[PDB]
Design a binder for this molecule. Sequence first.
Ligand SMILES: O=C(Nc1ccccc1)OC[C@@]12CCCC[C@H]1NCCC2
Ligand SMILES: O=C(Nc1ccccc1)OC[C@@]12CCCC[C@H]1NCCC2
Ligand SMILES: [Mg+2]
Ligand SMILES: [Mg+2]
Ligand SMILES: [Mg+2]
Ligand SMILES: [Mg+2]
Ligand SMILES: [Mg+2]
Ligand SMILES: [Mg+2]
Lengths: 234, 234, 10, 10
Amino acid sequence: GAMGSMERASLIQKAKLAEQAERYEDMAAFMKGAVEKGEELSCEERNLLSVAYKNVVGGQRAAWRVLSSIEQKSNESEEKGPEVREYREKVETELQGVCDTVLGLLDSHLIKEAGDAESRVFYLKMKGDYYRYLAEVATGDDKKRIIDSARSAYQEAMDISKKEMPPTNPIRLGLALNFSVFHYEIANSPEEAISLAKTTFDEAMADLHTLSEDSYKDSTLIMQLLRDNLTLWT
Amino acid sequence: GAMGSMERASLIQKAKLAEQAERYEDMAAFMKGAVEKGEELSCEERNLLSVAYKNVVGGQRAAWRVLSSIEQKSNESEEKGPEVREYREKVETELQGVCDTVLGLLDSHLIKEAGDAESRVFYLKMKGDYYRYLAEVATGDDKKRIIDSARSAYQEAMDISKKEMPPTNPIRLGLALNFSVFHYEIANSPEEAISLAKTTFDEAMADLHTLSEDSYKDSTLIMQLLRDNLTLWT
Amino acid sequence: RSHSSPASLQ
Amino acid sequence: RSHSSPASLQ
Ligand SMILES: O=C(Nc1ccccc1)OC[C@@]12CCCC[C@H]1NCCC2
Ligand SMILES: O=C(Nc1ccccc1)OC[C@@]12CCCC[C@H]1NCCC2
Ligand SMILES: [Mg+2]
Ligand SMILES: [Mg+2]
Ligand SMILES: [Mg+2]
Ligand SMILES: [Mg+2]
Ligand SMILES: [Mg+2]
Ligand SMILES: [Mg+2]
């Protein structure tokens, strides 16, 4: 790894600078380097890792959707040659590479060292998320297995979160939100998505009374996304 | 060049797709490949080249400004180590590399084959612009020479544009706009900047009567930027 | 599409 | 700062 010679603390500092500069590819490289030091990540460091890669893959997903739409239109009328497919495939392969990189960091060795609920759920949610992003572009004989890998990671995270975290915990909420998106957008299970979003929202509502003002703000922000989806889906 | 095996027309097509997908690094790579085919560029192709690199360097300039501001604040109070300087230098070196790449394409061999006023002025303006971006970050013993290289390119473009193009020509207007920015922001010549912006604006105003509705829209868009700067500068 | 979680979670 | 030209010019 090209970050092997940089101090862990310097990598974290530079990831924060890269975030401020909106240099998310750099930020991801710095955070990958930090992970590769082999030590566990703190809460703040896990968040930096996620911000970095979410922004990188977000640009790729947005580009892939633009290109896929153009490609589908080109098949509805004039023949334009292989270029749209080729360039969609180029972006797709790069996106798959980023997802594979994240999944590799989780498997070597973030998840296996994560013993506390907050870290383990966060990483299993991330595993589900990056398999979900792979599923968004999958079409061949492995699509079903990719979908099931996302489902399995989300389900393990859900099982831990329900046993170990209050219903308003932002990690628990974000996980449930994303698993509901998986059901609606990936698994062709809109009813499951709606039911999960509704139960998550109501159970969180009932636990808000235990929270400080700052925690209330964190939890209600994610609850609003559940509500926004329920409005789109019903 | 990694684009040597791709057809010129396919590179242009993919540059347009990359633009739609907001993949400006790809767009620049495709347009560099197109230039390296050795043929002259059409008006539309010159615009694609400029859009691609302007967006790439724009992200780098924005990042450099964020980092430079943090670095200057860190010198006003706690010592934080070499990391801010190092990362500012990393972004700076990448920015300089992009500018050097563009200047290299102009020198090998876009400018020397550009005989028509519209192409030659466009490329000389670009040369001034990329030396200007180098000047924005320059500090050592070559800063004066970088500034003078920008000035010389802009001046040659101005001399051609005044002889060969009407005052409302969008290339002429954009050149004058950027040379005025050079005077104000780089060369410590705000009066020259103001005078150039004013004379450019008034001479364009007087030529609008010759234009069609579509050309009028093109020219007045750039004239508004001259006015916006005059408001900032006075 | 649907809304998913922000990257940073407390 | 100051406004500079858009990249595309007709
Ligand atoms: O955001 C807020 N309120 C708030 C936040 C911060 C400071 C002050 C007030 O709650 C959103 C939500 C959950 C809690 C009750 C209101 C409800 N409204 C529908 C969506 C979920
Ligand atoms: O944009 C427009 N007008 C317009 C454009 C498109 C269609 C209809 C009208 O002109 C801007 C400018 C130059 C020309 C006269 C007005 C003037 N106003 C100050 C700035 C320069
Ligand atoms: Mg036809
Ligand atoms: Mg542990
Ligand atoms: Mg929150
Ligand atoms: Mg102190
Ligand atoms: Mg020629
Ligand atoms: Mg215009």
